[PDB]
């Protein structure tokens, strides 16, 4: 069994974000790290949107990311610290649209190691030197300079090592043009290692360390070291030199301290807490991210707290030293992994989970009524600052970026009655969590929809002017009628200006800038913008059958191949040429090539009959009425078209198959893609010419990264379509379904998956699908949280506490502010969940409809109750009722693990999958973490106990139990009699259950400790599964294993387990942790494949190989792309896929799909050893993606 890995959608969560002039122009761009994918994004200053310029899979964990600019330069390079052990300096080339490895300096071993640097990264603000650093012991400084050729020169690494020292955060110091200084937060753990009393850990204070680097002396000196009053998390570089004072801003627990040496005392300002906060008073606020803004005159800092409140920090100096720190509340955004303030007042809030946002900075917050907190005002050192969090005043939301991070559960199912199944994915964390339905295809937004009597068969969008993109009178005709509508500011069904009129027209095309030739079955008239209806008589009495009309040529073919051709005369008279020779049969498809205004005529013309035979000739007058190349297709070509750019001729057959060939005088490389007959038409999507095919399943041959992708559209199944333009739709499609005209427009360019999101309240752990009503039974469990009843009662308790904590005269103001606090409700998804408590939880159960967004039922659990498993099942003792069993841990504290018990709620799922009624609740001793139906009974994993339960009257009856499971059951699978149990640390355990004697007999296991998140079943012997570290393994029982095994003292296993062992037949490191696997088929008519979804927001697939020769070819392709195209971070691809366990029986197609993005000389250099052309290698690479799921 050999597989092949593909990525349908890449990872969308953002770890790091930096801003700078990476393209070298004046506009600023964002570089974001999606984990193992580096992306370059362009925030548009006009429309406010975000365009992803580049995605590169670097095949390694990007542990740090920071950009630097040299002195006097106008371009920004990207410094990447990774798990490769190498520091990589990259430059964006906008001409080739790729990242060039400018520098790759090797210093340590590969992996996220404790002392090999890569985790922490600092730059000098003048770009003179960078410092890479590990968590422990090891800091390296690279001095960066330029030669005379304006290139980049990196020095040898200067060791600034210090053994037995932890690094919290490193950053450069804006000292100006002096010696470059690096600021570190350090901990000295050596005193606490040799102290058994534990007093040293209580007194090991942090040190702010200033490492100076003397460039002339070429060494790193520990210039300054100071103790800190509390442990800080990170540092902000104050812009210094002539721009302002130097020094650092230490962010810490409930305090921010400006610190600088010399005659500067440290200035301490408390972090302001929310006024009447609903969190516990024992907690403290730390800044999660910061974004300095070096303006022309005055700088400021945007520091976001843990709740999500942005604070604007300024420093009142009145000298080179700083006298005051002034914080001020800015706004409230979701919690950001990184914030990037931009020029022209933008702010890219890259949220740590869920969708990212881009806001526009409207105001600064200076001449307003909000109070500004200062460090110079007196305090009693017992009361902090209180601010009232109001909604967005200084920020205007202009864009969002849809991110699937984190995917917590997934299911592939055709719940909507369509042909292809959908991806039902539980996303998000906490109040921003949701459930997203993902469908294949680009999103289509309607502009104007109208209803017309009579089913159309031939409609067109015709404009009276070539320059005017809007159709002046679109001929929306039918087979017998013609409901042509003129479109100006609005569409009105008027057909006075058309030559057809009330007569039906089978074709209406623009033959000139001010003239259009309409070939109705009455005749062909080249009617101009005026009433110049010259109804030219066709050769013979036959009507119009086939039309090949371009902007400079027109061919009308009757029955028998009466190819009446006409070129572009300068006068504009409807005339038919004398070259009208009858062919063997009429052309089912007739098309011409591109006819731009620069060219006098087209270069090609194709006519294909309904007897499965096509011909393509030149459209010039030298090759008129004489074919040049032939095509013996197995099916009759229903339509044909030519799309410019690398032009291609696409012919759609009578079935749902479109063959695309390269533009040539002869037949090119024919690639067939599956897609009612294919009535293909042309359109102008984003300026680029593309083809749209209407069939039983629609298709739109878009060009994303110059790739021919036949992605469908999320719209109504139209019978015909044409390109159109309007005010609401500047580049859209005017289409006709069964008696319904519509205008449809698309927004996203690539759009491999379109998502619709239904919001939730807590973090969704798992959901199951009811097989009868087709609904989703979601469990949402959140740590550190309050249930709504407990949150309301805690708000009431806080109001009752503050009205007596006032305790003086004139309490009307206190009562009215308590009422104003009680009645309001800040949104949890915007202002954060104001919830706290280490032992506290909040869990709900939600039966929800997957089609719409309605929640059918919502059962709110208790305070310290936490749902962790859910299943739906029938029973043998009970009838056809569907029972929902929910496993709940009671008062579970995660660190350290101390569970107070457990419960299993049972519900009868009344009102046909739309309501849960609480029937009973069976208490158990451990967490019932895995619930699975089993042969009419149910299997519950209570800690390390595997219990076969049957449904009783008032409780659940434990009918069988096994306790040879090692640590903790996290998942139970079931096929036939065999039960596959996942341990939290050990591998899958096979249990043979006999219905006789009621015994759960363990008979097999696998010999690897795998922190299995989830499992899946392939057949009776093979089990797939994932890892908590980002791996996917597939294990299989060997043949002729005796499953009928049955004292226990004498009999022993092979190695502390069963006597039979399961062999591993696949292992592959994804790099992003997989939480859902499913053996499904995404497109109908394809073949089954193993789909996995990852916590970073990515969806991938594994495809079995159907032949030895395909496996050998893709093995050789992967071997060549490992060497001739190394990954961008310097990580070895083979060692990255062999991270925790070695790669086995898979071929990574994420590297093999970089063959198309590799340089063409390198492409033919790779492909010459395969004895195939690079088009043939790209055809095989696309064939393995299209013959399986996309």
């Amino acid at each position: 069994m050999f597989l092949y890995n593909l990525t349908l959608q890449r990872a969308t969560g953002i770890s790091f974000a930096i801003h700078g002039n990476f393209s070298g122009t004046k506009q600023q761009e964002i570089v974001v790290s999606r984990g193992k994918i580096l992306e370059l994004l362009r925030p548009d200053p006009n429309t406010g949107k975000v365009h992803t310029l580049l995605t590169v899979e670097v095949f390694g964990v990007i542990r740090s990311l920071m950009a630097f600019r040299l002195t006097g330069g106008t371009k920004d390079y990207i410094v990447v610290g990774s798990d490769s052990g190498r520091i990589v300096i990259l430059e964006y080339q906008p001409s080739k649209n790729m990242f060039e490895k400018i520098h790759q300096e090797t210093f340590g071993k590969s992996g996220c190691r404790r002392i090999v640097p890569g985790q922490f990264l600092a730059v000098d603000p003048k770009g003179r030197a960078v410092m890479i650093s590990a968590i422990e012991k090891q800091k390296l400084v690279y001095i960066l300079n330029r030669d005379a050729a304006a290139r980049l020169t990196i020095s040898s690494p200067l060791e600034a090592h210090k053994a037995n020292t932890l690094v919290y955060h490193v950053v450069g110091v804006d000292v100006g043009f002096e010696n470059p200084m690096f600021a570190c937060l350090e901990m000295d753990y050596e005193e606490a290692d040799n102290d058994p009393t534990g007093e040293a850990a209580a007194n090991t204070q942090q040190t702010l360390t200033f490492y100076e680097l003397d460039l002339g002396l070429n060494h790193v000196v520990r210039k300054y070291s100071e103790p800190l009053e509390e442990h800080g998390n990170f540092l902000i570089t104050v812009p210094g030199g002539s721009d302002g004072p130097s020094g650092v801003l230490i962010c810490s627990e409930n305090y921010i301290t400006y610190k600088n040496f010399g005659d500067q005392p440290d200035i301490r300002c408390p972090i302001p807490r929310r006024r009447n906060d609903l969190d516990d008073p024992e907690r403290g606020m730390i800044f999660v991210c910061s974004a300095t803004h070096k303006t022309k005159s005055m700088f400021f800092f945007l520091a976001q707290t843990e709740q999500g409140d942005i604070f604007k920090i300024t420093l009142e100096t009145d000298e080179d030293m700083v006298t005051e720190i002034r914080l001020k509340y800015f706004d409230t955004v979701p919690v950001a992994a990184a914030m990037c303030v931009l020029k022209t007042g933008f702010l890219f809030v890259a949220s740590e989970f869920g969708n990212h946002y881009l806001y526009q900075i409207a105001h600064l917050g200076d001449d307003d009524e909000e109070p500004e907190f200062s460090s110079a005002m007196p305090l009693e050192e017992g009361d902090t600052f209180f601010f009232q969090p109001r909604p967005l005043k200084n920020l205007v939301l202009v864009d969002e970026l849809d991110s699937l991070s984190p995917i917590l559960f997934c299911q592939i199912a055709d719940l909507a009655n369509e042909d292809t199944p959908q991806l039902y994915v539980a996303c998000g964390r906490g109040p921003r969590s949701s459930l997203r339905v993902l469908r294949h295809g680009l999103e289509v937004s309607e502009m104007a929809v109208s209803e017309l009597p009579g089913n159309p068969n031939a409609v067109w969008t015709v404009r009276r002017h070539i320059e005017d993109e809007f159709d002046a009178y679109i001929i929306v005709s039918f087979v017998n009628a013609t409901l042509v509508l003129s479109i100006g500011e609005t569409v009105e069904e008027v057909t006075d200006s058309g030559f057809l009129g009330t007569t039906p027209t089978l074709s209406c095309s623009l033959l000139g800038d001010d003239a259009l030739v309409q070939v109705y079955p009455d005749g062909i008239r080249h009617i101009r913008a005026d009433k110049r209806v010259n109804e030219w008589k066709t050769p013979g009495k036959k009507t119009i059958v086939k039309c090949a009309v371009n902007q400079r040529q027109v061919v009308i073919a009757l029955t028998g191949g009466e190819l009446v051709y006409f070129e572009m005369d300068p006068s504009g008279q409807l005339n038919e040429y004398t070259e009208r020779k009858e062919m063997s049969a009429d052309v089912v498809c007739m098309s011409l090539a591109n006819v731009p205004p620069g060219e006098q005529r087209s270069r090609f013309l194709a006519v294909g009959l309904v007897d499965n035979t096509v011909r393509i000739i030149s459209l010039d007058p030298s090759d008129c009425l004489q074919p040049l190349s032939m095509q013996a297709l197995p099916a009759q070509p229903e339509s044909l078209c030519i799309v410019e750019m690398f032009l291609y001729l696409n012919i759609g057959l009578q079935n749902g198959v479109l063959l695309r060939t390269v533009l040539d005088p002869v037949t090119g490389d024919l690639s067939d893609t599956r897609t009612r007959p294919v009535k293909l038409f042309r359109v102008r999507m984003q300026g680029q010419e593309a083809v749209l095919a209407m069939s039983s399943r629609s298709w739109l041959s878009y060009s994303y990264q110059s790739r021919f992708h036949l992605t469908p559209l999320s719209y109504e199944t139209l019978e015909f379509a044409s390109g159109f333009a309007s005010e609401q739709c500047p580049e859209g499609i005017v289409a006709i379904s069964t008696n319904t005209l519509r205008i449809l427009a698309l927004e996203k360019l690539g759009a491999v998956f379109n998502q619709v999101a239904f919001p939730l309240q807590y973090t969704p752990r798992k959901f199951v699908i009811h097989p009868e009503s087709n609904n989703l039974i979601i469990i949402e469990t959140d740590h550190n949280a309050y249930t709504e009843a407990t949150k309301a009662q805690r708000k009431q308790q806080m109001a009752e506490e503050m009205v007596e904590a006032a305790g003086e005269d004139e309490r009307e103001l206190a009562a009215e502010m308590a009422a104003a606090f009680l009645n309001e409700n800040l949104p949890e998804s915007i202002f954060g969940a104001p919830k706290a408590g280490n032992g506290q939880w909040a869990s709900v159960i939600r039966v929800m409809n997957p089609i719409q967004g309605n929640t059918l039922d919502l059962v709110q659990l208790e305070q310290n109750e936490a749902a962790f498993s859910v299943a739906v099942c029938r029973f043998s003792n009970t009838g056809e009722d569907w029972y929902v069993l929910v496993g709940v841990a009671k008062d579970l504290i995660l660190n350290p693990r101390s569970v107070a018990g457990g419960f299993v709620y049972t519900y009868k799922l009344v009102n046909n999958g739309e309501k849960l009624e609480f029937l009973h609740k069976t208490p158990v001793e451990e967490v019932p973490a895995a619930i699975a139906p089993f042969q009419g009974r149910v299997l519950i994993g209570v800690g390390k106990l595997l219990r076969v339960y049957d449904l009783g009257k008032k409780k659940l009856l434990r009918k069988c139990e096994n306790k040879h499971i090692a640590n903790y059951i996290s998942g139970i699978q079931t096929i036939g009699h065999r039960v596959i149990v996942s341990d939290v640390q050990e591998s899958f355990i096979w249990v043979r259950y006999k219905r006789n004697e009621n015994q759960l007999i363990i008979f097999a296991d696998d010999t690897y400790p795998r922190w299995v998140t989830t499992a899946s079943l392939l057949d009776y012997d093979t089990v797939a599964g994932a890892d908590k570290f980002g791996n996917i393994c597939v294990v299989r029982l060997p043949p002729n294993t005796n499953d009928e095994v049955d004292k226990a003292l004498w009999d022993r296993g092979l190695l502390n387990g069963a006597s039979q062992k399961a062999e591993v037949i696949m292992n592959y490191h994804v790099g992003e942790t997989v939480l859902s696997l499913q053996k499904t088929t995404l497109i109908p008519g394809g073949s089954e494949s193993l789909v996995y979804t990852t916590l970073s927001g990515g969806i991938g697939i594994l495809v079995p190989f159907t032949s030895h020769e395909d496996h050998d070819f893709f093995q050789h392709v992967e071997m060549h792309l490992r060497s001739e195209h190394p990954p961008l971070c310097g990580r070895d691809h083979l060692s990255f896929r062999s991270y925790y366990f070695p790669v086995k029986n898979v071929i990574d197609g994420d590297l093999c799909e970089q063959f198309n993005s590799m340089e063409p000389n390198k492409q033919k250099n790779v492909s010459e050893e395969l004895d195939r052309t690079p088009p043939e290698v790209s055809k095989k690479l696309e064939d393995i993606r299209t013959r399986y799921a996309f």
Binding site: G85, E105, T106, F107, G108, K109, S110, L140, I154, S155, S156, P157, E159, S1135
Partner: protein
Amino acid sequence: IFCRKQAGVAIGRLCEKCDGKCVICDSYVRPCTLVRICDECNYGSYQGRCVICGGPGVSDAYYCKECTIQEKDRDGCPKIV
């Protein structure tokens, strides 16, 4: 016997007697990654000298394919002292 300092930008060299040999494991099969050496081992009169004998260097020193597979190229300057 190995220097094992932090290597820098200097490229290790081999003499005519050991041209093509892997400095770690002595194998002549499949060179892979260019050898980098510390700055002290390339300072002054030591520049361009053989990383095994200190004699004149005529070719670039390489780690073999087996050494780079086992990440023996990430252990520091392999100049023999």
